[PDB]
């Protein structure tokens, strides 16, 4: 519950209507109807997943809400669909090539819902009488509507001895493997032992004696390749990034078995999204790889964001729009974000204030909207926070003009920093 509000916490989805009509202000967003409708339609395409290898480029001036609309789409997509957010400079690893990192990122945003039929027996253990030779045992499971006694085997008795199960424990035994899983207790333990005090759990299902076809959908991403590349996979799946596995017999074989599962009804493919923020940092080799990697059937939807116009492509000398080669730039379609006006800026500032739980006068809102239209929006939020803190220190109830104007001089913007920078501190 203790998680602080970040720069994109004010947004909590992409405000859209039944007909995908964008709204002025909803779900923490304001203005920018065109790019928001583009986000809505690409999100509909993602949730459809019928087509693979689609790319979208979010372009615009800084502070136009590129990362904002990206996080909004991520939120609107909701759980059950992977959304791999990554920065352009994260692919540069000292233990795995750029192409390998891109393959990892692509396969990481693809999920397979594996269906598994289970048969679990549950109930209340009324009698767990076990005859230890130092071989024979019987279990008396009880439910709210029926009871049954089961003769325990040697291995089952040993498993029960492993996980201590006293009378009155709510357990869920899997008839397939016999794994002992304790859920709780139905009553106290004799009220006499001067220890082991806990709370009592609710009774089990009436038909819990034998659940026939308990369906559990195990969801896992296509990053499962780490499970095969090495005999010990937890080390690679948890921390180790040195996963330069062999592409042959791993990628192709896993894809083939995933197709077999999809055809045989075991699992279903759920393509996610790969959001590369500041994609301009990718080397030209990474762009050349994305050009071809984006053509596979397992290719997720590649959302990208650029904050530049004509700029040199990293790893070469010639320039291209958005710092992306002409090929990949032409392949994808671009979503331009128009700057926000004064009203939109004021509304965004008000939404941020509401998020931060801070209140300020109308004149404060006006002067702060002015300052934000002049300097920037993020700087306006910084001033919101600073003025709220100055007001709290001042013992006031709401932020007045005298606090925003004070923190404006206390904290400087880059435009004024460079102005006072004429002291030639260093070069």
């Amino acid at each position: 519950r203790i998680e602080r509000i970040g720069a994109h916490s004010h947004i909590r989805g992409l405000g859209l209507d039944d007909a995908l009509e964008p709204r002025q202000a909803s779900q923490g967003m304001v203005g920018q109807l065109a790019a928001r409708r583009a986000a809505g339609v690409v999100l509909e395409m993602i949730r459809e997943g019928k087509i693979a290898g689609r790319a979208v480029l979010i372009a615009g001036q800084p502070g136009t809400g590129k990362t904002a609309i990206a996080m909004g789409m991520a939120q609107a997509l909701g759980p059950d669909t992977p959304f791999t957010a990554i920065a352009g400079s994260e692919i540069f690893s000292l233990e795995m090539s750029k192409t390998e990192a891109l393959t990892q990122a692509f396969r990481r945003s693809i999920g397979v819902r594996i269906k598994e039929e289970t048969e679990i027996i549950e109930g209340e253990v009324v009698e767990i009488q076990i005859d230890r030779p130092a071989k024979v045992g019987k279990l008396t499971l009880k439910t709210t509507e029926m009871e049954t006694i089961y003769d325990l085997g040697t291995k089952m008795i040993e498993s029960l001895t492993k996980d201590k199960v006293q009378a009155g424990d709510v357990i869920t035994i899997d008839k397939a493997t016999g794994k002992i899983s304790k859920l709780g207790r139905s009553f106290t333990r004799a009220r006499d032992y001067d220890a082991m005090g806990s709370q009592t759990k609710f009774v089990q299902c009436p038909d819990g004696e034998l659940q026939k076809r308990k369906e559990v959908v195990h969801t896992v991403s296509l990053h499962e390749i780490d499970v095969i590349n090495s005999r010990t996979q937890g080390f690679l799946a948890l921390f180790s990034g040195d996963t330069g596995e062999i592409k042959s017999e791993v990628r192709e074989q896993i894809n083939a078995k995933v197709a077999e599962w999809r055809e045989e009804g075991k699992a279903e493919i759920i393509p996610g999204v790969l959001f590369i923020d500041e994609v301009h940092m990718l080397d030209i080799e990474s762009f050349s790889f994305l050009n071809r990697a984006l053509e596979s059937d397992m290719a997720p939807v590649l959302i990208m964001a650029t904050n530049r116009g004509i700029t040199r492509i990293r790893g070469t000398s010639y320039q291209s729009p958005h710092g992306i080669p002409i090929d990949l730039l032409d392949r994808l379609l671009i979503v331009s974000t128009t700057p926000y006006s004064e009203k939109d800026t004021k509304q965004i500032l008000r939404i941020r204030c509401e998020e931060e739980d801070v209140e300020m006068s109308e004149d404060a809102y006006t002067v702060l909207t002015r300052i934000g239209l002049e300097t920037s929006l993020r700087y306006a939020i910084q001033l919101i926070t600073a003025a709220s803190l100055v007001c709290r220190k001042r013992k006031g109830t709401e932020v007045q003009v005298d606090d925003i104007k004070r923190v404006y001089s206390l904290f400087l913007d880059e435009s004024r920093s460079t102005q006072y920078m004429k002291e030639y501190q260093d070069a």
């Binding site: 994109h8 921390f239 993020r378």
Partner: protein, 435 residues
């Protein structure tokens, strides 16, 4: 060993109750607006409401940016963690730059985890009161309870524990006369060792005899452990327990610091939230002071202005000393403070003006005081004058050598002659430029 560091006089921002700035601000002098901004941002940190916020301590060299940084750090107190980092440390040959930055961000975040355990200890006097066989079945011999006579230094208290634990008692060498470590819920017995009262001087053995427990048998030990999120990340990263990990050749290369985002985020964050909302731990976000931020590559700034966008990112205090300079890793891309113009928009710039000659004199005097050497009025005036001529940091470095010269010359206080001689024996770079 006091081991006075370069600048240890700073003890805090020294702001008045009203939040304004004063001269004798707990060691640090001057820099009114800068110290007020430091107070605002430390109040922010204490609030623990905002995350991923960065501040830039831009200012010419010698303005004491690191000084005020350590001041605000001390003001925060040892309670919240403070991880100092320099831009050069990001360049690692084994782990990528962005992952080092993320590890530093994690270190900057603290987490106090409490743990209360009810345990019983004392000299055991085992005895099983015979009880009629299970009344539900036939007859014979059974045991319905097992009484353990735990004897502690304060007294004795018999515990009628559950009979199922008898297996644990027989498992370990729990004989009458030894100290056992009982657990309330688990019940597992862990023998600490025999009592020292039986440790005859003629018995040769160690780690087997332990003193009697002091206090009541029932002890509710409350312990708190403060570990940063990076500590938990590292702990959950590497394995432990068998699995042929004892190998030397193929395993001694422990530096596998490489880390993935799935483990870093996700499960660890969820378990932390579970411990928080359950009452087992309390999150404590700290601060990440990054001096020489201009030394980072553009591949580092492009990841910084994305990590700062996360809700979990802690407060970062950048301190750039250079001016308009080409960004590292870029082809003649000049930007203010050596930082891309895109990141400067996300940081609050705290400007620090140059110290007034009077402030130079105050700094020299307080540094001499901290060093513990008396300086005459004329010597202090000469030190202030030379600190006005050249860089101020040169004067403070002339105290200890001048002090030693004075002590060797037979005098206690640093006379003007001593500083005059040291200025000719040692000089600054501005004068050394005359090649």
């Amino acid at each position: 060993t006091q081991r006075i560091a370069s600048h240890s006089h700073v003890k805090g921002l020294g702001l008045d109750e009203s939040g304004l700035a004063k001269q004798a601000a707990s060691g640090l002098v001057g820099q009114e607006n800068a110290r007020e901004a430091c107070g605002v941002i430390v109040e922010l940190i204490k609030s623990k409401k905002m995350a991923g916020r960065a501040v830039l301590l831009a200012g010419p060299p010698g303005t004491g940016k690191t000084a005020l940084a350590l001041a605000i750090a001390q003001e925060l107190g040892s309670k919240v963690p403070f991880c100092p980092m320099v831009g050069s440390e990001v360049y690692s040959t084994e782990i990528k730059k962005t992952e080092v930055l993320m590890e530093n961000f994690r270190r900057a975040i603290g987490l106090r985890i409490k743990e209360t355990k009810e345990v019983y200890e004392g000299e055991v006097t085992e005895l099983t009161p015979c009880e009629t066989e299970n009344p539900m079945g036939g007859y014979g011999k059974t045991i319905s309870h097992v009484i353990i006579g735990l004897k502690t230094a304060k007294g004795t208290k018999q515990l009628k524990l559950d009979p199922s634990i008898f297996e644990s008692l027989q498992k370990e060498r729990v004989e009458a006369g030894d100290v056992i470590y009982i657990e309330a819920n688990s019940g597992a017995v862990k023998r600490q060792g025999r009592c020292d009262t039986y440790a005859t001087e003629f018995d040769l053995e160690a780690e087997e005899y332990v003193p009697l427990p002091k206090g009541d048998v029932h002890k509710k030990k409350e312990i708190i452990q403060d570990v940063t999120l990076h500590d938990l990340d590292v702990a959950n990263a590497r394995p432990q327990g068998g699995q042929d990990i004892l190998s030397m050749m193929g395993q001694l290369m422990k530096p596998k610091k490489t880390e993935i985002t799935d483990k870093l985020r996700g499960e660890i964050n969820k378990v932390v939230n579970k411990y928080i909302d359950q009452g087992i731990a309390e999150l404590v976000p700290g601060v990440l002071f990054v001096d020489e931020v201009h030394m980072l590559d553009i591949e580092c700034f492009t990841y910084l202005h994305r990590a700062l966008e996360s809700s979990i990112a802690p407060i970062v205090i950048f301190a750039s000393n250079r001016g308009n300079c080409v960004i590292r890793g870029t082809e003649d891309i000049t930007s203010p403070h050596g930082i891309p113009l895109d990141l400067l928009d996300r940081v609050m710039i705290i400007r620090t003006m140059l110290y007034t000659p009077q402030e130079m004199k105050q700094i020299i005097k307080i540094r001499a005081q901290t060093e513990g050497i008396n300086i005459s009025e004329e010597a202090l005036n000469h030190l202030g004058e030379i600190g006005t001529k050249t860089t101020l940091r040169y004067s403070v470095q002339l105290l200890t050598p001048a002090n030693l010269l004075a002590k060797i010359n037979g005098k206690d206080s640093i006379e003007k002659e001593h500083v005059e001689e040291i200025s000719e024996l040692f000089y600054d770079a501005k004068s050394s430029a005359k090649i």
